[PDB]
């Protein structure tokens, strides 16, 4: 029997024993299993992190867009409100203007009737002066005829008195014819006056009714 020879025990040879390698293998799995506790958590923690925020943003987005909805809902109300106000404000003008016109119309028509009447009275008032005036002239002659006879070449009152009686009555004829004429022109003047007023009314009425 050859003498025993013993391998040296080395870090290498010990390292390679399969019993000792079984220690390593156990250890790695223990670390795989640790990585398996971390990956689960790592992933799941990010899952909570993401889940909360992703819905957290949605909650805010729900209100945020809602707030926009409340401006359109308000402004759209606020704009019509303006339209309601202008529409009736627009009436206010139309309502008022109609009275302006009606009253302006009314006033013009009143103004007409007055002036028309003012002309009538101006004529009437004149017409009466003419007759007094005339009366005077007629009276003045009556003296003038009478005074002349007294200074006339008639020698005797018998003849003097006969001629004034002739003259006076002749003059009374003239006084009456004079009166007939002024009666007539005055009547003619008046009618023509009232006919102008009448037509003015007719034309004024047609002229307004147009507008």
Residue numbers in the entry: 23 to 174, 176 to 234
Task: Provide passages from the article that reported this PDB entry.
At the inner surface of fly photoreceptor rhabdomeric membranes, the master scaffold protein INAD (encoded by inaD for inactivation no after potential D and contains 5 PDZ domains arranged in tandem) forms stoichiometric multi-molecular complexes with phospholipase Cβ (NORPA), Ca2+-permeable transient receptor potential (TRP) channel and eye-specific protein kinase C (eye-PKC). In this study, we show that the PDZ45 tandem of INAD functions as a supramodule binding to the entire C-terminal coiled-coil domain and PDZ-binding motif of NORPA (CC-PBM) with an unexpectedly high affinity. Our biochemical and structural studies demonstrate that INADL PDZ89 forms a supramodule and binds to the entire C-terminal coiled-coil domain of PLCβ4 in a manner that is strikingly similar to that of the INAD–NORPA complex. The striking similarity between the PDZ scaffold and PLCβ interactions at the molecular level might point to an evolutionarily conserved molecular adaption in PLCβ signaling in the animal kingdom.
Like the coiled-coil structure of mammalian PLCβ3, NORPA CC folds into an elongated three helix bundle structure with an N-terminal short helix coupling to the middle region of the helix bundle. The packing surface of NORPA CC-PBM crystals involves an extensive surface composed of α1–α4. We reasoned that this packing surface might overlap with the INAD PDZ45 binding surface, and therefore prevented the same surface from being used for crystal packing in the PDZ45–NORPA CC-PBM complex. We noted that the solvent-exposed face of the α2 helix is lined with eight Lys residues, which are all evolutionarily conserved and required for the membrane binding of NORPA CC (and see below for more details). The evolutionarily conserved, positively charged residues in the α2 helix of the NORPA CC are aligned on a flat and exposed surface of the domain.
